[PDB]
Design a protein around this ligand. Structure first.
Ligand SMILES: CN1CCC(c2ccc(N(C)C(=O)c3cc4c(CCC(C)(C)C)[nH]nc4cc3O)cc2)CC1
Length: 207
């Protein structure tokens, strides 16, 4: 287990998301589905030049899995996945610039729903989640588990859990008052409204 401090800007963005009064919390789903779609595009683009990349899974899809018992919503995709380096770099200087621009825009009157336009849409997960876990598997590396309850730090460990071939899984440990995102009619309503034009199949699982 390795513990890391978030960069100053990201820690700042995260406490801003957790402490600002915002009712339109549903925007997290579109942001996560969007990131899933980008990873799926990346693996499909790599299979033109190298068809052997689809060996770890041929199917390109997105699964939405609510679990009322664990109070979790899981967003699984069979995209390109992330290596330990890709994972560390994505929480690094690449995000720093977008984070500062978005926080500057929020002062000027921009709302939290514009987060994706600055490439930091992942952090909207903290509008509904008290903890976020990210399990990822890339063809060129091992399976990794990333975790943060915010608080200025995150952990990275080699995942000992069930293998997933290739892709990324985002597990949102929902706040007690956010269990509406476990409901079928509510997830359907959000996906139909915010992510109706995704070039990949999205399956909402039942309980
Ligand atoms: C405007 N840009 C923003 C970053 C965009 C991007 C999209 C996808 C991925 N890859 C390769 C993923 O495997 C993946 C990551 C995901 C995250 C972020 C997890 C975090 C711990 C913060 C690194 N959330 N949901 C995900 C679903 C995914 O399949 C990396 C970057 C690329 C475009």
């Amino acid at each position: 287990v390795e513990t890391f401090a978030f960069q100053a800007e990201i820690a700042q963005l995260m406490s801003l998301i957790i402490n600002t009064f915002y009712s339109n919390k549903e925007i997290f789903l579109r942001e996560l589905i969007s990131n899933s779609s980008d990873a799926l595009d990346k693996i499909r683009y790599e299979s033109l030049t190298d068809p052997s990349k689809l060996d770890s899974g041929k199917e390109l899809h997105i699964n939405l899995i609510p679990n009322k018992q664990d109070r979790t919503l899981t967003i699984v995709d069979t995209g390109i996945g992330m290596t330990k380096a890709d994972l560390i770099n994505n929480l690094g200087t690449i995000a720093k610039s977008g984070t500062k621009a978005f926080m500057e825009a929020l002062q000027a009157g921009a709302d939290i729903s514009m987060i994706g336009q600055f490439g930091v849409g992942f952090y909207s997960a903290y509008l509904v989640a008290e903890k976020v876990t990210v399990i990822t598997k890339h063809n060129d590396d091992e399976q990794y588990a990333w975790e943060s309850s915010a608080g200025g730090s995150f952990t990275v460990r080699t995942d000992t859990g069930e293998p997933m071939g290739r892709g990324t899984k985002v597990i949102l440990h929902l706040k007690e008052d956010q269990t509406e995102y476990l409901e079928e009619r509510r997830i359907k309503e959000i996906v139909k409204k915010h992510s109706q034009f995704i070039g990949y199949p999205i399956t909402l699982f039942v309980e």
